[PDB]
């Protein structure tokens, strides 16, 4: 149950 | 001695290596394990104060201390983004990883 | 390249050495991943039915297929309770990490 | 956002 970042490109 | 097991050694290693001894990162450990960490990345990063950003997000960040499990996230972020853009754009020889990160940018 | 970077190439090969073309894992290619990256791992899990218990409790999984997500949502289960234990149980790492995982099962 | 499994010992 852990929230993470997005990273696009 | 395994491989998955040193990756996992590696990254317990290197929050604990930056963090020291209080037991989590301040933005400023933060800066400078993904200025050693993720080279080019931050650098190529064309906001240039995505570490802000970056910081600003994370999961527990709001006393300014960055937990294991918060510094994991980025770990999770970063690595889940990668091989998202690996597997679409590509599909062994090292240093990719290394170029995938650089046309990584936060959202 | 990091270690950092080292690591997280790792994971994602890892996954792909063992997923192979088809992009996912099943329980028999996963259940081979762990033997392999996880020695002794399973074996000292004192049970049978061990690996299917498991992929249940993955983030996505319940179709008998484990994306990347999927067994990334593994490596923080593995890597967070190594830390947790190696926060209390220690303080020294110059593999410790395989000796963790020995002590560790599920819930 | 990611569940994970949570070992214990």
């Given at each position: 149950?852990?929230?993470?970042?997005?990273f696009?490109? | 001695?395994?491989?998955?097991?040193?990756?996992?050694?590696?990254?317990?290693?290197?929050?604990?290596?930056?963090?020291?001894?209080?037991?989590?990162?301040?933005?400023?450990?933060?800066?400078?394990?993904?200025?050693?960490?993720?080279?080019?990345?931050?650098?190529?990063?064309?906001?240039?104060?995505?570490?802000?950003?970056?910081?600003?997000?994370?999961?527990?960040?709001?006393?300014?201390?960055?937990?294991?499990?918060?510094?994991?996230?980025?770990?999770?972020?970063l690595?889940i983004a990668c091989?998202?853009?690996?597997?679409?754009?590509?599909?062994?020889?090292?240093?990719?990883?290394?170029?995938?990160?650089?046309?990584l940018?936060?959202?």
């Open positions: 149950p852990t929230f993470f970042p997005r696009e490109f | 001695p395994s491989q998955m097991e040193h990756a996992m050694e590696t990254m317990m290693f290197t929050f604990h290596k930056f963090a020291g001894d209080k037991g989590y990162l301040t933005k400023e450990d933060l800066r400078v394990l993904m200025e050693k960490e993720f080279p080019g990345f931050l650098e190529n990063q064309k906001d240039p104060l995505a570490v802000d950003k970056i910081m600003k997000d994370l999961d527990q960040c709001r006393d300014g201390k960055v937990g294991f499990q918060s510094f994991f996230s980025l770990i999770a972020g690595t091989n998202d853009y690996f597997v679409v754009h590509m599909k062994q020889g090292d240093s990719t990883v290394h170029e995938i990160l650089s046309k940018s936060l959202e």
